Amino acid sequence: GSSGSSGKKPLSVFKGPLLHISPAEELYFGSIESGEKKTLIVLTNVTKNIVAFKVRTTAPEKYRVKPSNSSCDPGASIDIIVSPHGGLTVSAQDRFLIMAAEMEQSSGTGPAELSQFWKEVPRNKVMEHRLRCHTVESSKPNSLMLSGPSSG
Numbered sequence: 001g002s003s004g005s006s007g008k009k010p011l012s013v014f015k016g017p018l019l020h021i022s023p024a025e026e027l028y029f030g031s032i033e034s035g036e037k038k039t040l041i042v043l044t045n046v047t048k049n050i051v052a053f054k055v056r057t058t059a060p061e062k063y064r065v066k067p068s069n070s071s072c073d074p075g076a077s078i079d080i081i082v083s084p085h086g087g088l089t090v091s092a093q094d095r096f097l098i099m100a101a102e103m104e105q106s107s108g109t110g111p112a113e114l115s116q117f118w119k120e121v122p123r124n125k126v127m128e129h130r131l132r133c134h135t136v137e138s139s140k141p142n143s144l145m146l147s148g149p150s151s152g
Contacts, residue, residue: 004147004148005147006147016046018101019044019100019127021041021042021129022044027131027133028133029133030136040082041079041131042080044076045078049074050074051071052100052107052117052118054069055068055098055099057097062088063094064081065082073109092135095131096133101127102125
């Protein structure tokens, strides 16, 4: 008969006024590869100024988020890896957070300058973006399988 495997899905990002968040609000810990199941977040600084971003979560001592404290120059994209402990698994109640605040003119991107900027920048200016985890379960188009994109 007819059968296949895998499907497809669109990719959207939270168009932030300062720092962009990728993906928007959908984390999928599991790549097509049978290697590691870590998600990589992308932050596109649309602004023309430095933006200090920070990654948080309800369980930072479970998920390895790095960088979790840094900045992203204007007109550049950063990469934030998110790998869970090498024992447990991706939960559902688990939630991630990403901060982004526009810095002054010339501001470094260290543990100091930041600690300072995060001290000067008001929480009102601090843009927080909470991400969600799309726990993978029962991979199939609701019973049986059916999917065949444009191949060749």
